[PDB]
Amino acid sequence: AELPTHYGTIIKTLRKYMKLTQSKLSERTGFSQNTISNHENGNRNIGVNEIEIYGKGLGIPSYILHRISDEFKEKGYSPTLNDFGKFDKMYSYVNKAYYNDGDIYYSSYDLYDETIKLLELLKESKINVNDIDYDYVLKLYKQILS
C-alpha cells in the first residue's frame, strides 16, 4: 500500500532537523539519493513498510512519523513537527527512562502522548526543556503514570 504524500514532507523536515543530506540519509536507509528526493517531493509513493526504514535512518521510531501524520490529518499541520526540537529533547529522556527504569517500562501507556504531557507540564512551570536533566524528568514521568 501507499501513504499520504505528506509523509515526504515530514521526512524532509526531520531530515533537515537531523542535519542530514539526502546522500547521508541514503547511506542510512539504502534508498538511492534520487529516490529520497522523489519521496520528499511526492514523485514516488512511500510504502507502508518503508517508513520503518526511514525511521531507523533518522534515528526515530516510526510511530513518531505516524503520530505526526495523524495531526496533519486532523488540523492541516502538525504542532509537534513545528516544535520538534522540544519534542526531540524531551523524547531523549523518555526513551532513556523507558529502557532503564522498570517502573516506567511496565507503567507507561503511550510514549508519544507521555512526551507531549511532559512538555505541557514544563510549559505550565515556565521551564525550558534545555534546562532539565534526567532525574527531574523521571520524577515528572512517575507522577503522570501514578
Residue numbers in the entry: 8 to 153
What does the paper say about this structure?
The Staphylococcus aureus pathogenicity islands (SaPIs) are the prototypical members of the phage-inducible chromosomal island (PICI) family of mobile genetic elements. Stl is a DNA-binding protein that binds to the intergenic promoter region between stl and str (the SaPI transcription rightward regulator), preventing transcription of the str and downstream genes, thus maintaining integration of the island in the host chromosome. The remarkable ability of the SaPIbov1 Stl to target unrelated but functionally similar antirepressor proteins relies on the modularity of this repressor. In this way, SaPIbov1 Stl presents three domains: one corresponds to an HTH N-terminal domain required to recognize and bind the divergent stl-str region present in the SaPI genome; a second (middle) domain responsible for interacting with the trimeric Duts, while the C-terminal part of the protein recognizes the dimeric Duts.
